[PDB]
Design a binder for this molecule. Structure first.
Ligand code: NDP
Ligand code: NDP
Lengths: 316, 316
């Protein structure tokens, strides 16, 4: 069997380490090594890709399966000469639970005025800040897939009122849900918006001034909050800045940005009640991805269906 | 029936407001009002107390029941002339769920390096910080009462490994528990210590250097973390400062202090990876306290047992 082509432009040291023992039955070709840049890899069957080279499918034109290095596949969709073959994304219990850690933490920090507590602490000021309890606040989760459903369940346990939005209607016990055409209804009920959407043409430039002005205004936190850990190109950052400055948004938590790393001169870094994390909301341990690809290759090759295959028509 | 004596030294404006409609069948005497302070209230049956006047029981010597304004009663225990009558503490679903919000938030902020993320954000630095998932970390909850059991359940849902310590043995499904004599076993397994103990003579000056040096050292967060939302006099703050500076503790979250408000010259304010909240972890609305006292008076007066009565021998 030919080696697995690996073009993963994150944590190159971690990738190099794991590849020493990964795909033991065939080996790998790591495009992080500049010497592999011009290699003849025309017989490659499997490629593992994160922000891959734009010409990758010219250079590997006989692929059987494409594996994403993440849960998102927007870096692969739209590539030139993308073959009509399965694209398998990364879905993993550890990834999922880490995203829910981040979501719940951010929701609690907004509920409990972490920003204000930290500001007072820095000034050595003792100031009790009256917080509503979680049940007085509605968290609206946009995206009810692997990540969204886990976050919904854990937010509910913490005591938040939770509602959900997704493309097609969902049934989730104890959680009012809304489909694509019911976006405005959902927004009107939401105090804390949590974004867990994939990036598609339908979700690009989606979180804008008009949407922020539809969020609930007379809620227990006073002003609504925007949280996004999906994709940065789903939001309009200039609109986030203006909304926070104006009081349309009371605050935000952002793990993802229109261009990453977030530019040093962005106003977002020092906005009051805004939390920034550097696209690290759900970083699953380096080996879990590779064990996952190995498993799917094994299933594929012995006649079991591939799992976590994206819907090409839907684009995720 | 004589009016209820109220000496609650928190949120005096909120107390005055709620008292306008509380105890509708008998009224109240609020010692916040100077005109009440030297009145003859010798026939008082019920007193509601939070940081009360030291001479209160000389001035109200015929009490039938004492109600604490909080879940803790250490402010009442040890008062001069404390009568041999039931002391009823505040137990309330809103209080409980708010404490669990705080506990879970603090545990997540330590798990996910909130302090480090915030420090970088303030410097406009994009810097991924590798976090373990919750299941790689053991949270040891000290105190398995109303607050402890709620926190244990929610921490487990978030994915932490959770163990518990209490005076007498508990049975909690999926949670290894330890009794008084097993303290050292419990400490050795604990990466994040969560304090939800009452203040008694047995728990005074309890969280000290010796105890911090028994916490687990080779865990996924690197160094162990001390979280306390019980009582400030249970900790030795000089030892917390030295432990954090020396790397015995990786960080801390403290809602309670030996002397409150925390002095402006405390070294705690500026210690790296230390979060300070001003004894506001679980602040239930005043209405809930007053509805609670009304309920217990009603039960008492129609022959039903008082609930939430402290054990004088145990001291809580
Ligand atoms: N910040 C980080 O570290 C990470 C970010 N992510 C991001 O999270 C995203 C979500 O992951 P995951 O939950 O596994 O994906 P899923 O495919 O499992 O779920 C996606 C959800 O989004 C909904 N959705 C998609 N398009 C639309 C639309 N046009 N209108 C309304 N709803 C829509 C889907 O609706 P329906 O159910 O009807 O199909 C589905 O509920 C990833 O695509 C990735 O970009 C992922 C991992 C880590
Ligand atoms: N920061 C804040 O805003 C707040 C702080 N608090 C504090 O939290 C404390 C706990 O409240 P709550 O859960 O309702 O109280 P409980 O009486 O319900 O539970 C107390 C727990 O502590 C255990 N305990 C007591 N003494 C010891 C000891 N010497 N060794 C080991 N375990 C011991 C008890 O053990 P066992 O089960 O064997 O009896 C019990 O599990 C309050 O007393 C108060 O000081 C409360 C409210 C808000």
């Amino acid at each position: 069997r030919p080696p697995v082509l690996v073009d993963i432009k994150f944590n190159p040291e971690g990738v190099d380490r794991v590849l020493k023992t990964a795909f033991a039955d065939r080996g790998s070709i790591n495009l992080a090594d500049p010497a592999n840049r011009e290699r003849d890899f025309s017989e490659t069957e499997y490629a593992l890709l994160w922000k891959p080279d734009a010409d990758l499918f010219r250079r590997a034109p006989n692929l059987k399966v494409i594996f994403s290095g993440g849960a998102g596949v927007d870096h692969i969709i739209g590539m030139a000469g993308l073959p009509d073959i399965p694209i398998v994304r990364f879905v993993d219990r550890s990834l999922t639970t880490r995203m829910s850690e981040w979501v719940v933490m951010q929701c609690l920090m907004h509920l409990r005025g972490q920003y204000g507590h930290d500001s007072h602490q820095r000034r050595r000021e003792w100031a009790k800040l009256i917080a509503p309890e979680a049940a007085e606040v509605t968290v609206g989760v946009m995206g009810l897939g692997i990540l969204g459903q886990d976050a919904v369940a854990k937010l509910k346990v913490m005591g938040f009122n939770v509602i959900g939005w997704s493309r097609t209607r969902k049934t989730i016990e104890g959680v009012e849900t809304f489909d694509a055409g019911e976006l405005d209804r959902f927004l009107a009920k939401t105090d804390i918006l949590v974004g867990l959407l994939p990036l598609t043409p339908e979700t690009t430039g989606f979180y804008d001034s008009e949407l922020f002005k539809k969020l609930r205004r007379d809620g227990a936190l006073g002003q609504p909050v925007f949280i996004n850990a999906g994709r940065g190109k789903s939001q309009i950052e200039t609109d986030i800045v203006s909304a926070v400055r104006e009081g349309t948004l009371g605050g935000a938590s952002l793990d993802v940005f229109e261009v990453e790393p977030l530019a040093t001169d962005s106003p977002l870094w020092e906005l009051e009640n805004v939390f920034i994390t550097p696209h690290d909301a759900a970083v699953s341990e380096e080996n879990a991805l590779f064990r996952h690809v190995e498993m799917q290759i094994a299933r594929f090759e012995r006649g079991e269906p591939l799992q976590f295959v994206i819907d090409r028509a839907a684009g995720y």
